[PDB]
Design a protein around this ligand. Structure first.
Ligand SMILES: [Zn+2]
Ligand SMILES: [Zn+2]
Lengths: 87, 117, 154, 200, 48, 49
């Protein structure tokens, strides 16, 4: 599931096109996964070990990131393709 | 008599239905969407075999001689080629009440002779 | 008997004593060109597009690749030096020593398969030998798309 | 570690230095001594010849020739492309006749490559449909075979072409007369020899 | 990979054949899709 | 017997269950395929009788 199905689900999703004229694409490209991590208020990273998750009643989970490319077309088929990485 | 198949129009390839020649008293198979017609030869437009005396040997296929889960015997050599080994089995088909009868198939490749005893 | 007369060149081979079929595992690679530090072209795959999975694959490819180089001995003679050595042990087992990494070599009979060695000559293939045994390599011991910890929460 | 070009070269050079360390004791079993330590080199001699892996669906050995002779017969078999009367291309599998095997043994014992005036007769054994996969075909897994030459080393060679034969009355005698290599074939051998040389 | 091998082998696609050939041939299903027919099922099973 | 010999030393030689599957000596059979299998309970069933 982690290694194949998440990427398949993301890629199979139809890109979203919006009309207010200007139009947008917003295609999701590739997924990244970090290791299970906890941040306190300080925000300093630390690996969340399962025993700490049991003791502090945390969820043992990993953050999921995706590459998103946004393109805008208004006139003259001018492409404003911009890419947001690790969203 | 046996079952009477169906005929297809030579033009539209649709099913031909039976009609009679009122003036000539002859049986015709006549299309119903086009205007094709034909002269029948069987004269039997319908059959219904209640007793269902159907031959199970016709349905057996010789490939079952390759099934490793079938029992094999060396006491019923096949007439067609005299090979000594055969597989045997029952009919296992609905419309078979006294279905404990055995059927035999020769295991020699390229013979595939089916029979009963 | 339709006699088809074909003029084909005689291929003189030397297949030594033992011929083994080898399916290289994904972690072992062969570089056929000789290693010359001056002429050694590196992969240098685009840093950018690699993922942690690719990097572990690249690292494993650098250390576990069979290479050979030409070194000049003191007397100027070109001696071919290999980076891999196969040791025949007294018990009959073979281990592949690649640098410091040891891979166990298993001799398995290619039962059931009919792998033959042929040589392509012109428009035909000339048979040379039949593959009887397959070698499989395994690291001798267990002791032989991810991302790094995000610096800030999200 | 191996982020920089220079760091990769040093690590490879370190592997060559480590391979030069004499191997005296088994890495795990103290009572097991190395009988023979052989370096692994590419096959500098046989690389000139394009080797193919042929996978037969069924055993190609002639039914009647069991044992040691079938392996020798199969090791000298010839496959040639044949066009049926209908233009369909099939591969005929030819096995050497007993007379050819004796003539061939004479050549091997007399260290003569081929007797120029000797006709080596091959008899067609079976006709196959051929699937050929070359290095350029998408998905070709590069397979190697290792040759153990006692006292010299272990030599690896690539299987550039994979031919899978699937089973499809032509008493065809393939009459082979050996000739010397033409210039074009020799040039092809040099091009293959150059793959083992560091392309300046 | 299995579909590639089957096409590569002697299997006939379903659009290529004529319906007359189905009667005596072996239908081939992959993950429930009827993908073709074969004339020599036994040796195909041996190969697979 | 040679497979058993190699497995007895799996600690050292690293010969594992995966090598049995690779050498085509063991197979995974699901229920549908089991419908077509002729299965011996023990090797004593293969002895001639
Ligand atoms: Zn009609
Ligand atoms: Zn018979």
């Amino acid at each position: 599931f982690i290694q194949m199905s998440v990427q398949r689900i993301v890629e199979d999703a139809p890109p979203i096109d919006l009309q207010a004229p200007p139009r947008y694409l917003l295609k999701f490209e590739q997924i990244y996964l970090s290791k299970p991590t906890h941040w306190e208020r300080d925000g300093a990273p630390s690996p969340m070990m399962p025993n700490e998750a049991r003791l502090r009643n945390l969820t043992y989970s990993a953050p999921l990131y995706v590459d998103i490319t946004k393109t805008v077309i208004k006139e003259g088929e001018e492409q404003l393709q911009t890419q947001h990485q690790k969203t | 008599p046996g079952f009477v198949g169906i005929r297809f129009c030579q033009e539209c390839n649709n099913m031909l239905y039976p009609k009679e020649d009122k003036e000539n008293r002859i049986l015709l198979y006549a299309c119903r969407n086009c205007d094709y017609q034909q002269e029948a030869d069987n004269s039997c437009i319908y059959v219904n075999k209640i007793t269902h005396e159907v031959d199970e040997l016709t349905q057996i296929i010789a490939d079952v001689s390759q099934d490793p889960t079938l029992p094999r015997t060396e006491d019923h050599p096949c007439q067609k080629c005299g090979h000594k080994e055969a597989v045997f089995f029952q009919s296992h088909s609905a419309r078979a009440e006294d279905a404990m009868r055995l059927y035999y198939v020769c295991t020699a490749p390229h013979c595939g002779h089916r029979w009963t005893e | 008997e339709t006699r088809i007369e074909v003029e084909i060149p005689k291929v003189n081979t030397d297949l030594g004593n033992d011929l083994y079929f080898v399916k290289l595992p994904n972690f072992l690679s062969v570089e056929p060109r000789p290693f010359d530090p001056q002429y050694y072209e590196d992969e240098f795959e685009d840093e950018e597009m690699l993922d942690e999975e690719g990097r572990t694959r690249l690292k494993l490819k650098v250390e576990n690749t069979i290479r050979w180089r030409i070194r000049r001995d003191e007397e100027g003679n070109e001696i071919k030096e290999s980076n891999a050595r196969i040791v025949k042990w007294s018990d009959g087992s073979m281990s592949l020593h690649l640098g410091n990494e040891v891979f166990d070599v298993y001799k398995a009979p290619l039962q059931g398969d009919h792998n033959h060695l042929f040589i392509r000559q012109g428009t035909g293939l000339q048979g040379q030998a039949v593959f009887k045994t397959k070698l499989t390599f395994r690291p001798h011991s267990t002791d032989s798309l991810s991302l790094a910890d995000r610096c800030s929460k999200t | 570690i191996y982020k920089d070009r220079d760091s990769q070269i040093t690590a490879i050079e370190k592997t060559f230095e480590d391979a030069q360390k004499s191997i005296s004791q088994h890495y795990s079993k103290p009572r097991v001594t190395p009988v023979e330590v052989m370096p692994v080199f590419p096959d500098f001699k046989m690389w000139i010849n394009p080797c193919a892996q042929v996978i037969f669906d069924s055993d190609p050995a002639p039914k009647d020739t069991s044992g040691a002779a079938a392996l020798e017969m199969m090791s000298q078999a010839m496959i040639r492309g044949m066009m049926d009367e209908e233009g369909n291309q099939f591969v005929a599998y030819f096995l050497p006749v007993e007379e050819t095997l004796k003539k061939r043994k004479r050549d091997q014992e007399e260290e003569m490559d081929y007797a120029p005036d000797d006709v080596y007769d091959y008899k067609i054994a079976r006709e196959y449909n051929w699937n050929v996969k070359n290095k350029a075909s998408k998905g070709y897994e590069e397979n190697y075979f290792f040759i153990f030459r006692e006292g010299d080393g272990v030599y690896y060679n690539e299987l550039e072409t994979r031919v899978r034969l699937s089973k499809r009355g032509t008493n065809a005698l393939l009459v082979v007369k050996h000739r010397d290599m033409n210039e074009k074939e020799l040039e092809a051998q040099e091009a293959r020899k150059a793959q083992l040389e560091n392309h300046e | 990979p299995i579909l590639e091998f089957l096409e590569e082998w002697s299997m006939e696609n379903l659009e290529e054949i004529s319906p007359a050939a189905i009667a005596d041939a072996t239908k081939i299903f992959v993950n429930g899709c009827w993908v073709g027919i074969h004339k020599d099922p036994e040796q195909l099973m041996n190969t697979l | 017997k040679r497979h058993i010999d190699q497995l007895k030393e799996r600690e050292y030689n690293n010969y594992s269950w995966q090598d049995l599957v690779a050498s085509g000596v063991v197979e995974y059979i699901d229920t549908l395929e089991e419908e077509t299998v002729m299965l011996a309970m023990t090797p004593d069933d293969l002895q001639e009788k």
